[PDB]
Symmetry: C2
């Protein structure tokens, strides 16, 4: 019954470390077969998300295949048993593609270091979004990133007023969201930034102390900045970076503390594969480290709560949830490259509109 011309960003080359987007990615035109299966449905991408964790998926993506990504899609056309009818807005791992055909079921990430099943698509009810909480928040504070932050702070971390909370890679959306909730629950918040621009930005949001991780290239010099910024010890660590800062924070864990390992920038991107053993430090404090893989929380009730609980605070200016929306499908890898650029140009989540 027909086909259609579509643009895709495919994985051209595997490069370790801080990526070179123009070298890694290639826009191709690709003929998309439009004869939908029993439960398949033809989707139009409206927004794609650009995220640092994609640095890993790219290395596990077969050369020539399209680049995965959280996206917002519209149902152009749907097969007889599809989960959504034409017109429905949906969220899922659509990728850097203009159009795609999918049955919307949980697919498995076969070529992955860890076998992973991507979540089945979720429908968006447009009634939830307006100019203070736009639809693009479904890829940020009302989607993947917000669910990560909200999930950790309500289902794992119990922040007592007086606790000192350290957030690494704080300047991004998950770290700023986490820290602000910690400020709200009565915590001293310590964050980490890479420039003065981000450092004063995190200050506004209410971070009591911000450490320049680039100035503290050393793990000892990072341990001193940490000793003074958190004079009474760390009670909660929300870790996105790893490397020498987690080595530093783990040397100062209070009793009963809780670490949340969310990502490890320092090992994925900058390849800090060997370092001091951190496990000895957790024995006396009875510290609980927990890995975060927020997909587990992608359920209907959770999405409901995330809107009511968190969404209110965002629209009432009680919680800042910034976003930087470039425009144009052609500029997606450009937009992605900014995540590794030292410029102070990012606030919150980065999205592309198509």
């Amino acid at each position: 019954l027909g086909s259609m011309k579509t643009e895709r960003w495919v994985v051209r080359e595997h490069v370790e470390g801080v990526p070179d987007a123009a070298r890694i990615y290639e826009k191709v035109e690709t003929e998309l077969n439009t004869r939908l299966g029993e439960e398949q449905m033809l989707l139009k991408t409206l927004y794609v998300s650009v995220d640092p964790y994609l640095q890993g998926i790219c290395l596990d993506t077969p050369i020539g295949d399209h680049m995965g990504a959280d996206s917002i899609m519209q149902v152009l056309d749907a097969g007889p048993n599809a989960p959504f009818r034409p017109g429905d807005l949906v969220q899922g791992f659509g990728g850097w593609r203009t159009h795609l055909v999918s049955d919307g079921k949980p697919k498995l990430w076969q070529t992955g270091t860890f076998p992973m099943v991507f979540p089945a698509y979720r429908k968006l009810d447009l009634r939830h979004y307006d100019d203070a909480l736009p639809l693009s928040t479904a890829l940020g504070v009302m989607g993947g990133p917000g669910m990560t932050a909200w999930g950790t702070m309500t289902k794992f971390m119990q922040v007592r007023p007086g606790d000192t909370v350290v957030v690494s890679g704080a300047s991004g959306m998950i770290g700023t969201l986490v820290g602000q909730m910690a400020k709200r629950a009565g915590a001293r918040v310590v964050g980490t930034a890479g420039s003065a621009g981000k450092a004063r930005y995190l200050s506004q949001l209410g971070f009591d102390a911000v450490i320049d991780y680039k100035l503290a290239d050393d793990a000892d010099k990072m341990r001193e900045a940490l000793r003074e910024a958190a004079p009474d010890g760390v009670d909660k660590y929300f870790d996105s970076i790893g490397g020498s800062v987690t080595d530093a924070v783990f040397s100062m864990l209070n009793v009963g503390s809780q670490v949340a390992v969310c990502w490890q920038w320092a090992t994925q991107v900058q390849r800090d594969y060997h370092g001091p053993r951190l496990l000895p430090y957790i024995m006396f404090p009875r510290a609980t480290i927990r890995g975060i893989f927020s997909l587990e929380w992608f359920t209907e009730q959770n999405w409901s709560a995330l809107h009511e609980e968190l969404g209110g605070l965002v629209r009432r200016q009680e919680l800042v949830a910034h976003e930087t929306v470039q425009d144009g499908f052609e500029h997606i890898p450009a937009a992605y490259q900014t995540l590794f650029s030292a410029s102070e140009s990012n606030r919150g989540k980065v999205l592309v509109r198509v």
Copy 2:
């Protein structure tokens, strides 16, 4: 008015690594003032414990002072407000000494890496003991070690039937305790031994698989031995060893897994301070690692419970809890040295009768 001659083992020299007990320790004669205060007590040591963690306390024990140690002591004489009357059996950190004076109160370990409060002495009620669970069990299955194992299995680890539980340093008393409770909870249990003597000992008691960590000083054959022993992945890791075995186990953590870090022989004893970054492996499996410091559990309700839950199983021959009782105060470091001996002639908990 009153004094008493008492022998004490004092710390002559600090030596790092596998200890040289004959070189580190020294039997001295010590005149003990027996004129007790109104709430003090003169105590006689009946049994002393030798434990691999003493290697750490010995290095933090100021030169010339007595070597700390868990002991079982009897009240020779007590002031009018003492917490215990004469004849009473108590358990506490009496040390490698024949006689001592104490208020039985929580002493603080100033000279420690982490400020640590030694627990106040606990009274031993002889009704609790019999010919299958003798008085010496208060330093083993009915004391510190048993509280560690039972504490972790009842207050942290939830072993579901089918899980594969890996216990490192299994041949000792905490490790054998932990494995048998996982075996009883429906787990395939994997342990680690250094000789066929230890491994076949672990074979009896019910370990489905035993790994020769000495054959695999390298992590490559260690990750292979684990792949074979745990073909379906690790769900529960009870870690006493650390080092390249924990490196191997972290590469095969299933979803929802739980590590319990209890000690790190390879870092304390063998100085394995550096290794592969393990926190990256805990993200996707949503693993919860937790540090163990069983002092937190030394409360009366817990002690009642340890006798009820654990003590019953031992008395009903459902749980083997072996112990190796050296005799003679003169031999305390001799008995201590066997813990670090490359020969594996010791089974269960090691005590001296004095």
